[PDB]
Design a protein around this ligand. Structure first.
Ligand SMILES: COc1ccc(Cl)cc1C(=O)NCCc1ccc(S(=O)(=O)NC(=O)NC2CCCCC2)cc1
Ligand SMILES: Nc1ncnc2c1ncn2[C@@H]1O[C@H](COP(=O)(O)OP(=O)(O)OP(O)(O)=S)[C@@H](O)[C@H]1O
Length: 1140
């Protein structure tokens, strides 16, 4: 245990002194979950779940949305109200501070040291109570999140299967709804403490400025509803923008997958044009969003100026000509800031409260939704026509029981009913932890060994037996990681047969009596199914005398079982055995590049405008200082001039930040796209897709959403802090020399913070990722988990995960409180010293009263500007560190005028090729020649070098040696664009990117309609194309199920037809295609290609047999042969015929 909050001295419970040791150790050694503590018994999943379920029980025994609400209320009780009362007392003392400022200012102009030390004490106490309030509220919220999370997970166990969309709604119910609830519980005490704050503020300012005060008290208040309105607009804009963004991502996911396909003919620019077309729409939305952001930032600092303007001008020169002592004006200034700070929070509080109300309504709607069988009766509804009718079945021990029938006869339904999964209406069923593999296979977010063990102690002989008996070890070794390979989400990097074999292995490996397998032979061949039923079923299951109940439909399994079960229309037609059935019927460089992408045009326009705005904001008060003592009319007019300058300059600065941020986002995205386009193929193959896709998915989005606002806030905070320091220095010179020590202290407080605040931050992210994912895994494979009776262990795992999340999200708020309190203590020390120097120096000797006003008013508030500064600095640093990876990604004609000849005669003399710079060579002394108009075949085993030969023919490998030519022409003087408008290629991996048929046939779109129609008619595709809406305009999706595999290859051949390269490369147009269709495909491609030399590569016999010139790829080299009928009998059918 390390997080000891409840077990320390009640002084440190306030000032967080126990964090000194943690943060000092954290500076040196990197924090981790082993270096972190464990949550106390006072706050776990179990404790909060216990209190919440006790309250829910006491409320439901007296029987809903209001019910769950009151249950949470009575369950979390005293802590929340304690935080709220801390908060209101702090608010009172904060409203009290400026009045003692006023008293001091009065006394010196006409008992003040006492007021100064009282101000010091009241500041420190008020801020301490505020911080304790924040922390207690945050901890209550974290408790509530853990509690309702484990509660809705407990509910996930008892729900019914009849209720895809529900899974997404469940995981949003944990990712956004629960966060809304918890953040609303953060802001709950603020909603109680805001009204008393504004009421005390208005009544206090009225008694200081009189009737005029009221007028001012209106203006500031009028900003609070307006703000809300602005916020709403933002939200609307956000929605629209998000939509566009999503679409863009889709149009990217294709390009970053058909990489080799894309670059094999250089259609990449054609798709980049479309990608840029989407980007402009996205940019257009962003303008309005940033305009609203600018309006918000503008009002933020405009209302403070406007209040003082329309109040002071409307007080003296309007109403009663009352002499305005410096105390009145400066107290009004202080109260204006102390009231502006809370006003913004009310809008966000209202939004958070309504959103939390909706989310709790949603949570309530969700949260409240032998083997003997005699008289089976049930259905998939609380009321409806039944599908289970009159089923009586006995499943004795040690007996193979097949279930056979037609499609839709209640086979798997009977399986789940035997499981107890479906509580039958009227019937009896008796038989426990039963192993079960469902029809649709499911996996976890873990390794292969883990999925097959499934929380079971590992075995050597047992596990190796199960691995070998499932025909799974070779394909397991085929994976990039021989074992312990991280199986992707749902098994994207695996095939269906592998998932099925893993599921069957999981079912077989578990030690239990009963095993169900819902058709485990649907995605398996004949050989693998035979070996599985022989070794794993009849030899391994039948070994330990288990009760195997397998449902399938084959021939070999019928005489191997004991009981045959025939189902028809949900009824057992006949029953018995076989015989009874047959006898019956971050450095400054990242920011430097970020701002230099904007250019010199806007950098200075931003910086100098900010400097001038802050200079105006200080000069207005500097002139007010001389205004005070008493040409009052001229004074007020100068005040009005300054007030106007301030607001105009603020609007200018905001518009500048907006425009600059948008331009930078534009240029950065375009440069990233362009630099990713020109990368080599081996680079794309080396780097995983997640990192390349992820930068565009988030980095871009993150920057656009948060960099401009956070940068603006950081700049405003730092300049306001520097201005306040300069003010309190100019007021009292000696005070300056006292403030530089303390500020240096802050430097030491800075380092130790960041080197931990960053760390904890990332830890939070990590504990958020496997938690949510875990949830999803439980939802899909719910039947398997309720069948294995493994609910207890999984609930244990989820309590573990939510504890690991809460400890991180708790240490983070503890560290934020630490930095806050210490920076605030120093911000109170500085105002203490400033007032103590001002009372003596500026009164006893200097005798100038306009000074102390400015100094006190700025030192009463310097601390909040300091805190804004430091927090925004931390955020800007993490965001700039996120940006740096974008730059890391950023750093990755004599024969032309003569038309490319149709003579396909080529010759590659002494060719070699390597993949990486200075690695093992792929080819060795490759010499070959190809005659015009002659079909060429190439053979070889896997890894022989035929794909490498094709890629080198398209010079896709960047370490080839020798000279390679086409009609005396090579790659020494031609750019890539000409090199891709000269040859055609059909890859083994076909794809149909989204769009219309015109976008797939000719994405360039140069070709005319009759040309595409003829290409479809020749490619045996015109009839199915005419059977679609519109014709040549069917909206296709990436991959999908809109066309057959043969039709995808027909589209590839149509691409080849329209390419008109006159040279064709056929890279395994045979794999994963039915022979009945592949043979007619090759016949069409032969009858269509009488000219325009084609070089093919495959592992089929007849394809290699039909080619004229063929070269057998040896271990490292090739051996070519010209006449096909001569080399297939010269070696006496040893190396070229039986191999083919
Ligand atoms: C902006 O301040 C305020 C100023 C005045 C008032 Cl009347 C209220 C607040 C205020 O904020 N309302 C209290 C509720 C609240 C929410 C966030 C913060 S916080 O400081 O930003 N964040 C943390 O402490 N920890 C986070 C919490 C989320 C998980 C990760 C760690 C502090 C407090
Ligand atoms: N989880 C479910 N929720 C609601 N209805 C279901 C569910 N599973 C199946 N059904 C319905 O129950 C009917 C019968 O389903 P099955 O028992 O799976 O068909 P079966 O032919 O006996 O076995 P199969 O096809 O190998 S899974 C279908 O028409 C479905 O609409």
């Amino acid at each position: 245990v390390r997080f000891l909050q409840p077990f320390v001295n009640l002084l440190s419970k306030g000032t967080y002194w126990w964090m000194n040791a943690f943060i000092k150790t954290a500076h040196k050694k990197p924090i981790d979950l082993r270096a972190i503590g464990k949550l106390p018994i006072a706050m776990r999943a179990l404790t909060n779940y216990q209190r919440l379920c006790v309250a829910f029980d006491a409320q439901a025994r007296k029987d809903g949305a209001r019910a769950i609400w009151r249950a949470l209320c009575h369950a979390f009780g005293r802590r929340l109200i304690l935080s709220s009362t801390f908060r209101i007392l702090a608010d009172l003392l904060g409203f009290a501070g400026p009045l003692c400022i006023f008293g001091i200012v009065d006394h010196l102009g006409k008992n003040a040291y006492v007021l100064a030390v009282l101000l010091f004490l009241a500041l420190l106490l008020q801020r301490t109570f505020l911080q304790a309030s924040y922390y207690v509220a945050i901890e209550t919220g974290i408790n509530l999140r853990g509690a309702i999370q484990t509660k809705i997970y407990n509910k996930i166990m008892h729900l019914s299967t009849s209720n895809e969309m529900t899974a997404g709604q469940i995981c949003n119910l944990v990712a956004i709804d629960t966060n809304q609830l918890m953040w609303f519980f953060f802001l709950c005490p603020n909603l109680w403490a805001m009204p008393v704050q504004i009421i005390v503020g208005v009544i206090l300012l009225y008694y200081i400025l009189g009737v005029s005060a009221l007028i001012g008290a209106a203006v500031i208040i009028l900003l609070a509803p307006v703000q809300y309105f602005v916020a709403t607009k933002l939200s609307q804009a956000q929605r629209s923008t998000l939509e566009h963004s999503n679409e863009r991502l889709k149009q990217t996911n294709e390009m970053l997958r058909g990489m080799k396909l894309l670059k094999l003919y250089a259609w990449e620019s054609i798709f980049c044009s479309r990608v840029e077309v989407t980007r402009r729409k996205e940019m257009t939305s962003l303008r309005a969003f940033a305009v609203y952001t600018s309006i918000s930032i503008f009002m933020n600092t405009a209302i403070p100026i406007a209040a003082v303007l329309i109040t002071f001008v409307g007080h003296v020169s309007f109403f009663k000509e009352s002499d305005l002592s410096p105390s009145v004006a400066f107290a009004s200034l202080s109260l204006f800031h102390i009231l502006v700070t809370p006003l913004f929070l009310l809008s966000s509080v209202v939004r958070s409260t309504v959103k939390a109300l909706v989310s709790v309504q949603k949570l309530s709607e969700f949260l409240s939704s032998c083997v003997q069988i005699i008289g089976g009766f049930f259905t998939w509804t609380p009321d409806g026509i039944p599908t289970l009718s009159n089923i009586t079945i006995r499943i004795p021990r040690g007996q193979l029981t097949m279930i056979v029938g037609q499609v839709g006869c209640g086979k798997s339904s009977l399986l789940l009913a035997t499981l107890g999964e479906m509580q039958k209406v009227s019937g009896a069923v008796f038989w426990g932890p039963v192993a079960y593999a469902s029809q649709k296979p499911w996996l976890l977010n873990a390794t292969v060994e883990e999925n097959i063990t499934f929380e079971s102690p590992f075995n050597k002989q047992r596990y190796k037996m199960v691995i070998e008996a499932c025909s799974l070890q070779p394909d397991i070794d085929i994976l990039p990681h021989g074992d312990q390979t991280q199986i992707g989400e749902r098994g994207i990097n695996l095939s269906g047969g592998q998932r099925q074999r893993i599921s069957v292995a999981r079912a077989l490996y578990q030690q239990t009596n009963v095993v169900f397998l819902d058709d485990p032979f649907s995605a398996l061949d004949v050989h693998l199914s035979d070996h599985l039923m022989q070794a794993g079923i009849l030899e391994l299951l039948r070994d330990d005398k288990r009760t195997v109940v397998l449902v399938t439909h084959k021939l070999q399994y019928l005489p191997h079982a004991d009981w045959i079960i025939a189902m028809k229309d949900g009824t057992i037609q006949r029953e018995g055995t076989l015989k009874d059935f047959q006898r019956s019927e971050i450095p400054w460089r990242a920011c430097t590049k970020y701002l230099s992408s904007a250019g010199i045009l806007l950098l200075s326009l931003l910086v100098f405008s900010q400097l001038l705005k802050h200079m105006v904001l200080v000069a207005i008060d500097y002139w007010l200082a001389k205004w005070t003592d008493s040409d009052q009319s001229v004074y007020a007019m100068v005040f009005t001039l300054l007030c106007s300058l301030g607001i105009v300059l603020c609007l200018v600065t905001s518009v500048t930040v907006e425009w600059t941020g948008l331009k930078v986002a534009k240029r950065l995205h375009r440069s990233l796209l362009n630099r990713i386009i020109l990368a080599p193929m081996r680079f794309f193959e080396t780097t995983p897709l997640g990192s390349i896709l992820n930068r565009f998915s988030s980095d871009c989005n993150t920057i656009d959403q948060h960099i401009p606002s956070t940068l603006e806030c950081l700049s405003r905070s730092t300049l306001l802090c520097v201005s306040a320091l300069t003010v309190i220095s100019y007021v009292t010179p000696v005070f300056l020399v006292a403030l530089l020590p303390l500020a240096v202290v802050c430097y030491f407080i800075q380092k130790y913070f960041r080197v931990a605040s960053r760390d904890l931050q990332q830890l939070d992210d990590t504990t958020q990722l496997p938690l949510l994912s875990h949830f999803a895994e439980t939802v899909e494979g719910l039947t398997t988990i309720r069948a294995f009776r493994y609910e207890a262990r999984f609930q244990q795992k989820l309590l573990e995960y939510t504890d690991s999340n809460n400890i991180a999200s708790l240490f983070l708020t503890a560290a934020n409180r630490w930095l806050e309190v210490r920076m605030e203590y120093i911000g109170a020390c500085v105002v203490l010293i400033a007032a103590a120097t001002s009372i003596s120096n500026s009164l006893h000797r200097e005798l100038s009263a306009g000074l102390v006003g400015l100094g006190l008013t700025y030192a009463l508030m310097v601390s909040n500007y300091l805190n804004w500064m430091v927090r925004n600095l931390a955020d800007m640093e993490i965001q700039l560190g996120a940006v740096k990876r974008i730059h890391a990604l950023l750093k990755t004609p004599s024969l032309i005028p003569k038309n490319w000849p149709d003579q396909g005669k080529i010759q590659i003399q002494n060719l070699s090729v390597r993949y990486d710079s200075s690695l093992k060579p792929v080819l060795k002394h490759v010499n070959a020649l190809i005659s015009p108009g002659q079909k060429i075949g190439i053979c070889g085993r896997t890894g022989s070098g035929k794909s490498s030969f094709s890629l080198a023919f398209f010079r896709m490998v960047d370490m080839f040696e020798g000279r390679i030519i086409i009609d005396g022409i090579d790659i020494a003087k031609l750019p890539l664009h000409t090199l891709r408008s000269r040859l055609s290629i059909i890859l083994q991996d076909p794809v149909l990117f989204s769009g219309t048929i015109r976008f797939n046939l000719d994405p360039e779109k140069k070709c005319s309609d009759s040309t595409l129609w003829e290409a479809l008619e020749i490619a045996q595709l015109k009839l199915v194309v005419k059977a679609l809406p519109g014709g040549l305009d069917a909206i296709i999706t990436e991959g999908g199920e809109n066309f057959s595999q043969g039709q995808r290859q027909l589209f590839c051949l149509a691409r080849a037809f329209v390419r008109k390269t006159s040279i064709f490369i056929m890279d395994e147009a045979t794999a994963s295609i039915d022979m009945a269709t592949e043979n007619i495909l090759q016949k069409v491609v032969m009858t269509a290609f009488a000219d325009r030399t084609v070089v093919t590569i495959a592992h089929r016999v007849h394809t290699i047999l039909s080619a004229d010139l063929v070269m057998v790829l040896k271990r490292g080299a090739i051996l070519e042969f010209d006449k096909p009928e001569t080399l297939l009998s010269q070696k006496d059918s040893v190396f070229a015929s039986f191999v083919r």
